[PDB]
Amino acid sequence: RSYPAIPRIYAETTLNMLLKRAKKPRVHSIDEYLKDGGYQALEKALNMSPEEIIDWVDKSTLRGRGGAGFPTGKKWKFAVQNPGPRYFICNADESEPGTFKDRIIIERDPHLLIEGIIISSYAIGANEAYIYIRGEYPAGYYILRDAIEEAKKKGFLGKNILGSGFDLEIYVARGAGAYICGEETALIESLEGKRGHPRLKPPYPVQKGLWGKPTVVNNVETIANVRFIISMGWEEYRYIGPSDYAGPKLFPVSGKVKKPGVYELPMNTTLREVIFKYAGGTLGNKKVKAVFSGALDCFSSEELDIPMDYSPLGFGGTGTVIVLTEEDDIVEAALKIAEFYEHETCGQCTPCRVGCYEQANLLEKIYKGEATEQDWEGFDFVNRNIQPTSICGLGAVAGRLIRQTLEKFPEEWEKYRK
Amino acid sequence: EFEFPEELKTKLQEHINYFPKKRQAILLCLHEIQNYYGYIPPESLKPLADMLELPLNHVEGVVAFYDMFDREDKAKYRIRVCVSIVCHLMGTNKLLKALENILGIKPGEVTPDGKFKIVPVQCLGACSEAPVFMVNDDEYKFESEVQLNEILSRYT
Numbered sequence A: 001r002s003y004p005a006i007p008r009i010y011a012e013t014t015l016n017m018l019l020k021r022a023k024k025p026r027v028h029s030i031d032e033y034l035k036d037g038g039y040q041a042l043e044k045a046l047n048m049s050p051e052e053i054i055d056w057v058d059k060s061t062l063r064g065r066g067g068a069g070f071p072t073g074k075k076w077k078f079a080v081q082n083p084g085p086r087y088f089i090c091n092a093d094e095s096e097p098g099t100f101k102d103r104i105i106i107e108r109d110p111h112l113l114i115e116g117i118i119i120s121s122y123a124i125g126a127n128e129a130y131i132y133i134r135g136e137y138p139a140g141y142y143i144l145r146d147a148i149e150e151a152k153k154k155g156f157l158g159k160n161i162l163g164s165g166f167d168l169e170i171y172v173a174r175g176a177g178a179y180i181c182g183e184e185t186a187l188i189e190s191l192e193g194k195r196g197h198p199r200l201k202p203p204y205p206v207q208k209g210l211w212g213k214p215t216v217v218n219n220v221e222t223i224a225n226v227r228f229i230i231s232m233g234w235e236e237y238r239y240i241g242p243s244d245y246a247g248p249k250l251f252p253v254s255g256k257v258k259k260p261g262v263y264e265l266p267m268n269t270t271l272r273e274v275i276f277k278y279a280g281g282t283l284g285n286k287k288v289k290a291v292f293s294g295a296l297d298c299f300s301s302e303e304l305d306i307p308m309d310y311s312p313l314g315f316g317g318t319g320t321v322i323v324l325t326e327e328d329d330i331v332e333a334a335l336k337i338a339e340f341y342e343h344e345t346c347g348q349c350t351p352c353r354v355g356c357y358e359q360a361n362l363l364e365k366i367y368k369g370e371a372t373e374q375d376w377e378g379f380d381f382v383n384r385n386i387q388p389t390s391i392c393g394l395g396a397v398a399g400r401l402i403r404q405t406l407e408k409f410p411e412e413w414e415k416y417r418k
Numbered sequence B: 001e002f003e004f005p006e007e008l009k010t011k012l013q014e015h016i017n018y019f020p021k022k023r024q025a026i027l028l029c030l031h032e033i034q035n036y037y038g039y040i041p042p043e044s045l046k047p048l049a050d051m052l053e054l055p056l057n058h059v060e061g062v063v064a065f066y067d068m069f070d071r072e073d074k075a076k077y078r079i080r081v082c083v084s085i086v087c088h089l090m091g092t093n094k095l096l097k098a099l100e101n102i103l104g105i106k107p108g109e110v111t112p113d114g115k116f117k118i119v120p121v122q123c124l125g126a127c128s129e130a131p132v133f134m135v136n137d138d139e140y141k142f143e144s145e146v147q148l149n150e151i152l153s154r155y156t
């Protein structure tokens, strides 16, 4: 059938793994996927014990691609120490500013994700899996529903999959406008038909998740690696990139670069290389002023030689790269980040609820030149006091990037105060 | 007193039958209702509540929480315009200006004929194609007023 219009995001790979098909901006259906050896990793996995699959995924060094970088195998191992039934959830909520890596897998190579979900589900003994996709990805939703039907018709889903005795259904759920539903516990609340309110952790979902049962939540990109780990083996997988932070990584690059798009690169690539070697440099060859790591971190032009890995001095996050150049007003950009958090706090925790609102309200006053001295002092205070009593990561980071701009670009902020 | 047309009721029932538990279908149902009416009618929620086997209060709370749903304005076509950092950098304001030039409305407004509503939204996850907008489910990069005018002419 036809799907809603999608802009054709540029995609480029040096590894030819996650973007082997998704480098071309169109839906690759099951016959095309099968041609390339699609679903053969699944067939292999079904001839392995769950324990063995968990072991390979552990030894691969795969880490969560949804922002927290938790080791995937270890997560699975934790889930299976708890009595079943268990649930598997694919997190396709991708709503962080700058971040558009997951959609190109969903929309162009859905079977890569589906194959990974089935293997992952088998590994943890889940017979019921979910994809939670943000509501603003309607094409991805319809594409996934159709791909799941294709997989059923070829016997990769349903009961007694390929004679293995393993049963699996994959349900596709849709979000409805809340960034917070990407937080794994709020996602589960939404799957249970409620508001997206994060739960106090611990317990972690792997102990008590959907309907209080052991639940593994993994990001789309994380899951898209599973086929490769089974296909190649963990040893060969670990030979991709540097041996500590191994494997392909997707980098959604936007803002003031000549070639904005998604880049599949190893994690020893530097930030400078991402911008200048791969993304074609800056618009107008203007000087880089800052890189926003989505809405999380702000790196200065003195920090471009860092690796795009999960190391302490590395870029980290989700590899989201928003490039600002010399003429971009840092305070204007900070206001946009404040506005995001204002719009997305769920309001459960008081300092988060009040702090996200006040941070944006006062920063807007500052930007417009209408801030009193008290407003300035209040802004500083609030920025530093969003995190207390927070039960999820949003409250913990709502002031982080903005504080970094205050520290790294004092001269520009001072201009607004004077 | 208010009742779903049978064709819509059929589709709501499909959603409710899709997940293991009925209440899991609440967002799919609300999307379906909004698609059908051009908004969420307040009167729709009690009947929906009954089908989901949920208290009305629960359904109301969910509609209020989730930003895609609109109980106030009917519109045939929602023009969702990204106002987050990357689109702002790359020209949200030019898109909005072009929209006002073509349609005569600003964010939050509906045209008098009820045809178009401009809806400011957070990052749509297409930042490389900034500035981004949607027309209902279709999504586009804004290039210019001439280009936008041609896109919008496809929605009648």
Ligand SMILES: Cc1cc2nc3c(=O)[nH]c(=O)nc-3n(C[C@H](O)[C@H](O)[C@H](O)COP(=O)(O)O)c2cc1C
Pocket: A063, A064, A065, A066, A067, A068, A069, A070, A072, A091, A092, A093, A094, A095, A096, A179, A180, A181, A182, A183, A184, A185, A217, A218, A219, A220, A222, A223, A392, A393, A394
């Ligand atoms: C406010 C907030 C929003 C989040 N949004 C996403 C998201 O859109 N997608 C995602 O996979 N993880 C998101 N996460 C992280 C998830 O809670 C979780 O760590 C992740 O889905 C686990 O999968 P992974 O181990 O494969 O990364 C978010 C976390 C927070 C605190």
Ligand code: SF4
Pocket: A180, A197, A198, A344, A345, A346, A347, A348, A349, A350, A352, A353, A390, A391, A392, A393, A394, A395, A396
């Ligand atoms: S920290 Fe903020 S977003 Fe997270 S649960 Fe508390 S109020 Fe909600």
Ligand code: FES
Pocket: A097, A098, A099, B082, B083, B084, B085, B086, B087, B088, B122, B123, B124, B125, B126, B127, B130, B132
């Ligand atoms: S900032 Fe507009 S699509 Fe991401």
Ligand code: NA
Pocket: none
């Ligand atoms: Na072996």
Ligand code: NA
Pocket: A093, A095, A133, A134, A135, A175, A176, A177, A178, A179, A180, A181, A182
């Ligand atoms: Na969402």
